[PDB]
Enzyme design. Structure first.
Site, PDB file in Angstrom:
ATOM      1  N   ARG A   1       0.822  -1.199   0.000  1.00 49.80           N
ATOM      2  CA  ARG A   1       0.000   0.000   0.000  1.00 49.80           C
ATOM      3  C   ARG A   1       0.869   1.268   0.000  1.00 49.80           C
ATOM      4  NH1 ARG A   1      -4.351  -2.472   4.290  1.00 49.80           N
ATOM      5  NH2 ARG A   1      -5.873  -3.287   2.768  1.00 49.80           N
TER       6      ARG A   1
ATOM      7  N   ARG B   1      20.424  -7.549   6.784  1.00 51.16           N
ATOM      8  CA  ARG B   1      19.778  -8.854   6.838  1.00 51.16           C
ATOM      9  C   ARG B   1      20.782  -9.969   7.181  1.00 51.16           C
ATOM     10  NH1 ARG B   1      20.936 -12.112   1.533  1.00 51.16           N
ATOM     11  NH2 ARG B   1      22.518 -10.488   1.257  1.00 51.16           N
TER      12      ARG B   1
HETATM   13  N1  LIG Z   1      15.541 -18.263  -2.170  1.00 52.02           N
HETATM   14  C1  LIG Z   1      16.886 -17.920  -1.746  1.00 52.02           C
HETATM   15  C2  LIG Z   1      17.688 -19.208  -1.711  1.00 52.02           C
HETATM   16  C3  LIG Z   1      19.080 -19.074  -1.059  1.00 52.02           C
HETATM   17  C4  LIG Z   1      19.209 -18.159   0.179  1.00 52.02           C
HETATM   18  O1  LIG Z   1      18.839 -18.546   1.260  1.00 52.02           O
HETATM   19  N2  LIG Z   1      19.807 -16.840   0.064  1.00 52.02           N
HETATM   20  C5  LIG Z   1      19.997 -15.967   1.215  1.00 52.02           C
HETATM   21  C6  LIG Z   1      21.418 -15.533   1.372  1.00 52.02           C
HETATM   22  S1  LIG Z   1      22.139 -14.767  -0.064  1.00 52.02           S
HETATM   23  C7  LIG Z   1      19.140 -14.698   1.141  1.00 52.02           C
HETATM   24  O2  LIG Z   1      19.051 -14.015   2.141  1.00 52.02           O
HETATM   25  N3  LIG Z   1      18.499 -14.366  -0.080  1.00 52.02           N
HETATM   26  C8  LIG Z   1      17.697 -13.178  -0.180  1.00 52.02           C
HETATM   27  C9  LIG Z   1      16.363 -13.427  -0.880  1.00 52.02           C
HETATM   28  O3  LIG Z   1      15.710 -14.507  -0.710  1.00 52.02           O
HETATM   29  O4  LIG Z   1      15.906 -12.508  -1.634  1.00 52.02           O
HETATM   30  C10 LIG Z   1      17.479 -16.847  -2.678  1.00 52.02           C
HETATM   31  O5  LIG Z   1      16.853 -16.460  -3.715  1.00 52.02           O
HETATM   32  O6  LIG Z   1      18.612 -16.309  -2.429  1.00 52.02           O
END
Ligand SMILES: N[C@@H](CCC(=O)N[C@@H](CS)C(=O)NCC(=O)O)C(=O)O
Ligand SMILES: N[C@@H](CCC(=O)N[C@@H](CS)C(=O)NCC(=O)O)C(=O)O
Ligand SMILES: N[C@@H](CCC(=O)N[C@@H](CS)C(=O)NCC(=O)O)C(=O)O
Ligand SMILES: CCCCCCCCCCCCCCCC(=O)O
Ligand SMILES: CCCCCCCCCCCCCCCC(=O)O
Ligand SMILES: CCCCCCCCCCCCCCCC(=O)O
Ligand SMILES: CCCCCCCCCCCCCCCC(=O)O
Ligand SMILES: CCCCCCCCCCCCCCCC(=O)O
Ligand SMILES: CCCCCCCCCCCCCCCC(=O)O
Ligand code: NI
Lengths: 146, 146, 146
Positions: free
Chosen positions: B32, B105
């Site tokens: 929103r 994060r």
């Molecule tokens: N779905 C995750 C799979 C792997 C993961 O756990 N990445 C961590 C560390 S780089 C993360 O915080 N990704 C940020 C996000 O999910 O946008 C990704 O797209 O990165």
């Protein structure tokens, strides 16, 4: 300790967890290898295929678990655990395929689906046995009296 | 009532559910605040970071649950429940971090991973105990006769 | 066989699985009808709405399962199973709505949320009963001596 009748289901569940974590680490290295820094889920097609493999698997993962447990509890633990491994194994090939080629994902996807549908069928057969005697019995009570 | 030995696992599970619902409502208000109306999952980086935090958490959430239960059943309920809280708490910081900065994060992500890997290790140790005596026993039956 | 007290929860779980698989097949046909070949999760708005409906549902699906089980075990199996069906049914309308119009998704989403929040409340009430006597009892032991 009511563990004994359930440990195979739990251990396949754990293999599933390790496998999902494997996929997630793979996305981290493809994230680095192609300079695609969070957020952003787009890049070269090599990266996107790897992102999508992971996402796909992690979306079917709860379906898998749910049916794995219901099939293991209501039909037979060892068979459920067995489709479980085929499924998990097919999903490992799916991920490795998808990464090199999007077309090379299709063969292990088709194998993952058969295993998964088998678990569903087993689950459905399991619940039918539990429920259908109890209810046919009393459907036959309508017709008395008599 | 076979509830007693499981209520801690169930209550952490419920905290996890509330936490996930918390994230989901946060995406609704960021949806929103930046005029990003469904579908479309893209916008200013403030929005995208919040979308991705939610998505990330909701992808590890089943892994978390699976290992939380297997660890709680096969190793020890209270410890599993305890990593469970660290994990959930780390994931709350992850989400709050990600939203202000993508770099902010990383600290709670690293904490979420330690907790989660601890659950896995506990689960793995739990299943090892269940399975390994039974199978060493009969591996030793090969070597008789004798 | 400790199945009896749990078969309703398991069968709603299975309906949930079939429903999720239904959504997934729908994405496959919308993927074909608008020439949106993997990877790529973007296209005409008809396709995107269908992609997002599926994704949305599959994200709440574990929340649903978790609370369905905790509510069914700690409060009452039949009621939990009943909200379960409303929820699942509302989610079927959500998906069918979203696909034709993004605005026509809102009515069944609101119904899905009520059902889901009801499960949470039931779960919370269930855990309160389990835990609160045990702890009030011993809170009252502070005040002795006496
Ligand atoms: N779905 C995750 C799979 C792997 C993961 O756990 N990445 C961590 C560390 S780089 C993360 O915080 N990704 C940020 C996000 O999910 O946008 C990704 O797209 O990165
Ligand atoms: N993943 C959801 C999290 C929050 C949510 O549940 N949003 C509801 C109400 S605005 C929705 O229907 N979102 C549509 C979608 O997922 O594309 C999102 O991106 O919006
Ligand atoms: N989330 C899936 C839902 C349906 C599905 O399972 N599609 C299969 C067969 S076309 C797939 O491999 N999709 C590739 C992907 O998820 O990117 C999708 O976007 O396609
Ligand atoms: C009490 C009756 C409940 C009926 C549930 C039937 C489940 C069928 C499973 C496929
Ligand atoms: C074990 C359940 C026994 C009940 C018998 C019900 C008979 C009707 C179904 C054939
Ligand atoms: C019957 C034997 C099954 C073997 C499963 C081994 C599980 C190891 C868990 C880590
Ligand atoms: C409790 C199980 C007892 C069986 C003993 C098996 C011995 C081999 C493993 C050390
Ligand atoms: C041992 C005490 C554990 C306390 C957990 C309280 C759960 C409240 C559930 C809402
Ligand atoms: C069943 C548990 C009995 C214990 C009574 C505890 C009393 C304090 C809460 C009212
Ligand atoms: Ni028992």
């Amino acid at each position: 300790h009511h563990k004994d009748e359930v440990a195979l289901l739990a251990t396949v569940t754990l293999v599933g967890v390790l496998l999902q974590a494997y996929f997630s680490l793979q996305v981290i290295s493809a994230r680095r290898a192609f300079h695609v820094s969070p957020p952003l889920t787009s890049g070269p097609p090599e990266f996107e295929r790897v992102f999508r493999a992971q996402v796909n698997c992690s979306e079917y993962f709860p379906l898998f678990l749910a049916t794995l447990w219901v099939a293991g509890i209501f039909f037979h633990e060892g068979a459920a655990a067995l489709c479980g491994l085929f499924y998990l194994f097919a999903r490992l090939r799916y991920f490795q395929g998808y990464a090199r080629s999007a077309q090379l994902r299709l063969t292990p996807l088709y194998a993952s689906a058969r295993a998964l549908w088998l678990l569903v069928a087993m689950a459905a057969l399991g619940l039918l046995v539990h429920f259908l005697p109890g209810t046919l019995r009393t459907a036959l009570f309508r017709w008395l009296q008599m």
